[PDB]
């Protein structure tokens, strides 16, 4: 009826559009056969299952059709605005021309434009924060960027269900939604209708339309996270071809139309209708004048010490450790062996001592400054906090490996607190992930082995209460050397009260708070922003080693193992300066060089790494 369920005219006109579709389709120009035609036969040859659409070639199709008129209706502005219809309708436009929805056999995907095409000049893709996501974008085609958690095991989901009357013959096609359904019976066959006797229908699995969906939840990149609050998560819909491409701990730009699906909370809790919504996934994507910004830092020189200071100036003291943290942030250069096997590649730092130092405060700092850094504590982050659960994700489907900690922060540092309190299973995993690139879960529904690229920072308190000097090293230290072997840099921070310095620190702490700004007369601390920039620039270097530095390294190393063992029994220690000591130092100088940006790897960088090394321990003598 009119005056019920009104009609409203809109500028949108599908009739002419569908025509326009047929026009651009396979009748196309830029890419002797027109791209869509040929591609279409490749599918028609049965070889190609899915069809990826791109709006840029549509942009080109329009500038072709604009100029070079007649003026043709704008699909893009209409697609992104709706695009949902655009899927099915486009499908029909295609199905005609080939070298119904029941027999299609092909999947249709679309690729959004950013782009240089934006620069044409010509929005659909603005990679967005889930925060940035407003509930007003529903139905819009949107592109966003975030951290992949969940990322689920594809399971066949059925679209429509075919029963056959076998009396009236025919078929019964029941579309299906959400979790469950009740199978139809009797016969809806128009011939079995109004008959005294309706046929009985039984489904046929070969007939029905099934699909393997694949599910994921995505979390805010967390750099985007507003100063406060917490990073948000989002579900996503994926099916058919797009399935299996996803993995947890992935940073990807996904492009899909944002679609709602009805849900609400406790029934007493809903005014209606909400939507609870959903997201669907069409497509996924996983040194100019800025060198000036770096150059500000560079030209000043002493960037190693300058920046060294510039790290968490907030605390008084321990420039050595900070200097270490620098390289920790820098890393490099890894290697691969020829077969090949790789060697990290990264730094593993231990921070000993207690109670104070606010030793944690450092960790807070780094995790703050470091992109892809993650601050955690033992009891704290669960083992399954580090490990990933296979748990279904929404919209798309199903059984998603949702990772955390390591997987979450990989290729970036991971920060551990109360490191003593992490218990055992944790300790095992970590002991393993010292293999880098390695986490493996055989449990139950998980056969997978994840690659963790994270770096590790370990803050723990000595065996109670603090560092009994009467307790030997490793006596006062609760941890197994097996792990300690992994730890590249153990900074043991012990406190013997000293009248003079305590004055100094005391002043620092009085000046700030007294000032918000501590460093004065004179230190310029580096904005962690531009700092991070320079870091990016250095990370590119990949230096190479001098044979000489190699040699000195060797000799020294012999000296190192030699004295280390000459120590023999206890006190002192830890021996033995195992090769990993060597390799580590190698990576270390390899980093120091990168601060020079190097490729030279000068022996000074080495000797430094040494001084640092001797420096780390031996503090036990004071």
């Amino acid at each position: 009826m009119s005056a019920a369920l009104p009609s409203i005219q809109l500028p949108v006109d599908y009739n002419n559009l569908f025509n326009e579709i047929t026009d651009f389709l396979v009748t196309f120009k830029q890419d002797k056969g027109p791209k869509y035609m040929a591609m279409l036969q490749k599918v028609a040859n049965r070889e190609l299952n899915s069809v990826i659409i791109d709006l840029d070639d549509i942009l080109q199709y329009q500038n072709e059709k604009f100029l070079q008129g007649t003026q043709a209706d704008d699909l893009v502005s209409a697609i992104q605005q709706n695009a949902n219809h655009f899927t099915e309708l486009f499908c029909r436009a295609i199905d005609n021309n080939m070298p119904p929805n029941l027999t299609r056999r092909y999947f249709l995907y679309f690729k959004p434009l950013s782009q240089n095409c934006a620069r044409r000049y010509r929005i659909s893709s603005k990679p967005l924060s889930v925060r940035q996501i407003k509930g007003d974008f529903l139905g819009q085609l949107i592109t966003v960027r975030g951290i992949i958690t969940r990322v689920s095991d594809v399971k066949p989901a059925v679209e429509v269900i075919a029963y056959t009357c076998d009396q009236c013959g025919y078929e019964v096609f029941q579309e299906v939604n959400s979790r469950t359904f009740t199978p139809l019976s009797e016969c809806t066959s128009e011939e079995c209708s109004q008959n005294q006797t309706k046929g009985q229908l039984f489904m046929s699995t070969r007939a029905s339309k099934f699909s393997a969906f694949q599910e994921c939840k995505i979390q805010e990149l967390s750099q985007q996270v507003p100063v406060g609050h917490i990073p948000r998560s989002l579900n996503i819909h994926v099916n058919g071809t797009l399935v299996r491409s996803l993995s947890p701990g992935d940073i990807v730009d996904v492009t899909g139309i944002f679609l709602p699906a009805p849900y609400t909370g406790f029934k007493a809790l809903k005014a209606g209708l909400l939507t609870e919504t959903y997201l669907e996934a069409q497509f996924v994507r996983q040194t100019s004048d800025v060198e000036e910004r770096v150059m500000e830092l560079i030209t000043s020189g002493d960037v190693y010490n300058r920046l060294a200071k510039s790290i968490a100036p907030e605390i008084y003291g321990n420039l050595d450790v900070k200097k270490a943290l620098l390289l920790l942030l820098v890393g490099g250069v890894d290697k691969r062996v020829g077969d090949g096997m790789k060697i990290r590649g990264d730094i593993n730092v231990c921070l000993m001592g207690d109670p104070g130092v606010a030793k944690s405060q450092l960790l807070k700092a780094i995790c703050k400054i470091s992109p892809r850094g993650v601050y955690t504590t033992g009891k704290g982050s669960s083992g399954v906090g580090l490990t990933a659960a296979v748990m279904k994700d929404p919209v798309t489907d199903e059984m998603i490996l949702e990772g955390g900690a390591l997987v979450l922060a990989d290729n970036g540092i991971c920060c551990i607190d109360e490191f003593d309190k992490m218990d055992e299973s944790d300790r095992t995993a970590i002991h393993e992930v010292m293999e880098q690139q390695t986490i493996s879960i055989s449990k139950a529904g998980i056969n997978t082995t994840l690659n963790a690229r994270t770096s590790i920072l370990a803050a723990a308190n000595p065996l109670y209460g603090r560092y009994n000097p009467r307790l030997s090293p490793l006596d006062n230290i609760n941890l197994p050397a097996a792990l300690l072997s992994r730890f590249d840099i153990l900074f043991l921070m012990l406190d013997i009260p000293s009248r003079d310095d305590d004055e100094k620190l005391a002043e620092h702490v009085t000046y700030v708070h007294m000032h918000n700004k501590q460093p004065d007369l004179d230190f310029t601390p580096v904005e962690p922003s531009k700092m991070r920039e320079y870091i990016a620039y250095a990370k590119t270097k990949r230096p190479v080693m001098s044979e000489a530095v190699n040699d000195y390294v060797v000799q020294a190393y012999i000296r190192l193992r030699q004295d280390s063992k000459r120590e023999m029994d206890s006190k002192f220690s830890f021996g033995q300066a195992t090769p990993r000591t060597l390799l580590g130092i190698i990576r270390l100088s390899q980093a120091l060089a990168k601060l020079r940006l190097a490729d030279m790897v000068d022996i000074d960088d080495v000797e430094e790494a040494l001084r640092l090394v001797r420096v780390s321990k031996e503090s036990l003598y004071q």
């Binding site: 009826m1 005056a3 369920l5 009104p6 009609s7 409203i8 809109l10 949108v12 599908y14 605005q81 709706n82 949902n84 219809h85 950013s114 934006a118 620069r119 000049y121 010509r122 929005i123 407003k134 509930g135 007003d136 529903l138 139905g139 406060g228 609050h229 917490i230 990073p231 709602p260 609400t264 909370g265 406790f266 007493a268 809790l269 809903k270 005014a271 209606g272 209708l273 909400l274 939507t275 609870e276 919504t277 907030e314 109670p355 104070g356 606010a358 209460g465 009260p497 000293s498 009248r499 305590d502 004055e503 005391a506 002043e507 702490v509 009085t510 708070h513 007294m514 918000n516 700004k517």
Partner: protein, 601 residues
């Protein structure tokens, strides 16, 4: 066409023309909004090559402009409102017509009759425009909510429309019409629904207690929920203190509908809903009191007398007494520029055999305390926590019911049987105390919330009365950063001396047979006025002390941290506040020293 325009409506809109034309201020304001949107629209298109539609309205205008429209909206927002919003949307369309929504209003005011608080509410206020203030809990976790329906119809082409009126739609209720989900058009052509055409709006509904501060002496609190959607959604955290403009809805059938007690779920819609600031009493000092403070401030010995004023009933512990005072004061607060804030307040802890009145004192604390909540052992659930009230309450927006500490932010948290409390909580406490904030990811609303509350706790000796001789540690029994975290740790002993005992029992008997009233009064003004800032006069003394402290003490006892230092800081600043001094003084330092010593020894 609907029910056709009523000169009721027509005159309502038309009448609301001159206003807002006068006062024209809005006329350009909307244009501003449009402008902003336009500019942002150009930024998206050309560069890689937003604002809400509600505009506030001061009610002051109406009284002058239209007393009857004033009075009318106030009384009959139902009638007056919708036609007005229409007028707005129209003028909006007028401003920039060419390129191609509700266009709501805040209704500032100039309140109100109709100014009432959640304690005093309805039945006459029912379905009138209202302004109520109070704390934010149980909050909500928004759910997006859908709007108007759209359907494609083949082969007829065409399109359909549909709308949905929530119980929360409008404000004053209406005869409800269920529309369900339009499909299968008549004639029997199916209807292909279309999104992105069909509008939607985010949804949220939160609960509002009557202002804790303004709360009566003691009683049960009476809170009311309000729905907030889209733009209104999410503006404030649970535990925020706010005043909300919204109409009083009766919505829903009260049981007369189904024939087979309570009735008529009632709620507030939106609307303006302003977040407001409050300290971190009430009270009235008039002329005389403030004067009394002023004169007294000069008194050199005043502080000890104060320290005495607390314990009518309690002998001794003047050190402790002084401590409490300082707790009430609290070393101001410091939020560094673009950097973390220095905690001003101090956490206190007491240890001793029972009958120490530790329980008793805490009450006395709560009394003049000016808030805040008290907690005993376990205790919980969540203590300060929102519990992320599930589900929703209401509309699908999952509530965040602000817990003790959040509610106790700005205020004194009493922890009784602190030892008894679960470490599970304690983990959080580390955050709350030091970090000064609470963070909630739970399901769920992902937010970090601020509870600035100060802390005191009393907990039994580890086992029995053995506290006294017991080693400084393991007498403790609740390591560790716990121990660090309390700014103050007090060991009280029940050991007996006959002389002392007599001294007690005298006081005791007498009991059976500097006026505190003035106390909290003296407190509040001191609190808001004025901050002592800091002085290099002391700074030396302090560092001297601290170095002495770590230095000789780490031999003597432990722990001594930078924490110790900061505590000193807050300590001095408070003592200056007690002094009322706009500056820090070295004397106040000597005091904080004395006390900290006493803490240590």
């Amino acid at each position: 066409t609907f029910f056709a325009p009523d000169a009721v409506f027509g005159d309502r809109v038309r009448r609301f023309q001159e206003f807002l034309d006068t006062f024209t201020s809005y006329r350009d304001s909307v244009r501003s909004i449009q402008v902003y949107n336009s500019n942002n629209a150009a930024n998206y298109n050309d560069d890689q090559d937003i604002l809400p539609h509600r505009i506030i309205i001061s009610l002051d205008d109406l009284r002058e402009f239209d007393r009857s429209f004033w009075s009318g909206i106030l009384v009959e927002p139902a009638y007056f409102i919708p036609p007005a919003e229409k007028a707005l949307t129209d003028l909006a369309d007028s401003m920039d017509d060419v390129p191609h929504h509700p266009w709501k209003l805040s209704f500032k005011g100039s309140f109100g009759a109709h100014a009432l608080s959640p304690r005093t509410l309805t039945a006459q206020h029912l379905n009138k425009l209202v302004s109520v203030e109070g704390i934010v809990t149980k909050t909500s976790l928004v759910r997006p909510k859908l709007i108007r329906s759209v359907h494609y119809a083949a082969k007829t082409g065409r399109f359909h429309y549909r709308d949905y009126t929530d119980a929360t739609t409008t404000l004053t209720t209406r005869i409800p019409t269920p529309a369900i989900y339009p499909t299968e058009d008549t004639e029997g052509n199916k209807l292909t629904t279309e999104y992105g055409y069909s509008t939607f709006i985010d949804h949220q509904r939160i609960t509002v207690q009557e202002m804790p501060e303004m709360a009566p002496a003691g009683q049960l609190p009476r809170s009311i929920d309000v729905i907030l959607d889209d733009d209104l959604v999410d503006k404030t955290k649970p535990g925020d203190r706010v005043n909300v403009v919204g109409v009083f809805k009766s919505l829903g059938a009260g049981g007369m509908n189904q024939s087979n007690l309570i009735g008529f779920k009632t709620l507030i819609l939106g609307n303006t809903v302003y977040p407001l600031h409050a300290r971190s009493a009430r009270q009235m000092l008039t002329d005389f009191d403030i004067r009394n403070i002023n004169k007294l401030s000069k008194k050199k010995d005043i502080f000890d007398i104060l320290s005495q004023s607390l314990a009518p009933s309690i002998y001794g512990h003047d050190h402790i007494k002084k401590a409490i005072l300082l707790m009430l004061m609290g070393g101001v607060e410091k939020n560094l520029e673009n950097g973390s804030h220095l905690r001003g307040d101090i956490n206190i802890l007491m240890v001793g055999d029972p009958s120490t009145a530790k329980s008793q004192l805490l009450r006395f604390v709560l009394n003049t305390a000016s808030l805040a909540i008290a907690t005993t052992g376990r205790g919980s659930s969540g203590v300060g926590l929102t519990a992320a009230v599930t589900t929703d309450r209401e509309t699908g927006e999952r509530r965040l019911e602000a817990g003790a500490m959040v509610l106790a932010d700005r205020g004194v948290v009493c922890i009784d049987e602190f030892d008894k409390m679960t470490d599970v909580d304690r983990v959080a406490i580390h955050e709350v105390m030091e970090q000064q904030t609470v963070t909630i990811a739970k399901a769920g609303i992902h937010t970090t919330l601020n509870a600035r509350c100060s802390v005191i706790a009393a907990a039994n000796p580890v086992f029995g009365q053995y506290d006294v001789n017991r080693d400084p540690h393991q007498n403790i029994a609740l390591p560790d950063s716990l121990l660090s975290r309390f700014d103050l740790l007090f060991v009280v002993t029940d050991d007996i001396n006959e002389i002392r005992d007599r001294s007690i029992s005298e006081h005791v008997l007498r009991t059976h047979r500097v006026t505190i009233p003035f106390l909290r009064k003296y407190v509040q003004y001191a609190k808001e006025r004025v901050i002592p800032q800091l002085t290099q006069e002391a700074i030396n003394v302090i560092v001297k002390n601290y170095t002495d402290l770590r230095n000789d003490d780490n031999t003597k006892k432990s722990p001594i941290t930078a924490r110790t230092l900061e505590t000193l800081i807050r300590l001095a600043t408070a003592h200056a506040k007690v002094r009322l001094s706009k500056t820090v003084n070295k004397v106040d330092a000597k005091v904080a020293a004395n006390l900290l010593r006493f803490a240590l020894l």
